Structure 1
């Protein structure tokens, strides 16, 4: 489950994808989260 608590974070997170960066790296800096489970609510799945 790849989640993020804000559109602002989500945006630059996906922007970090385009240079060929692993979400793992981007999430950890951006603020987004990559969790094995945990069905994120509508404020973390944004």
Structure 2
């Protein structure tokens, strides 16, 4: 599950993913995160 700290981080994440970039790289590129669960925390609400 991906969680993002802000809307713009998420928007940048989704663009990063368009070419097929691994989520882990899109995460460090944006400040988004990968968690094993499905429940994003309040500070990664987007």
For normalisation by structure 1, the TM-score amounts to 0.77
Residues 7-44 of structure 1 deviation map (CA, whole Å, 9 limit, x = unaligned):
00000101000011011110112100001137224552
Structure 2, gaps ≥5 residues long: none
Measure, in 1, the Cα distance between the counterparts of 2:38 and 2:20.
26
Structure 1, gaps ≥5 residues long: none
Aligned Cα RMSD in Å?
Answer: 1.8
In the TM superposition, structure 1's runs of 4+ consecutive aligned residues that sit over 2 Å from their partners are none
Aligned length: 46
More helix by percentage: 2
For normalisation by structure 2, the TM-score amounts to 0.77
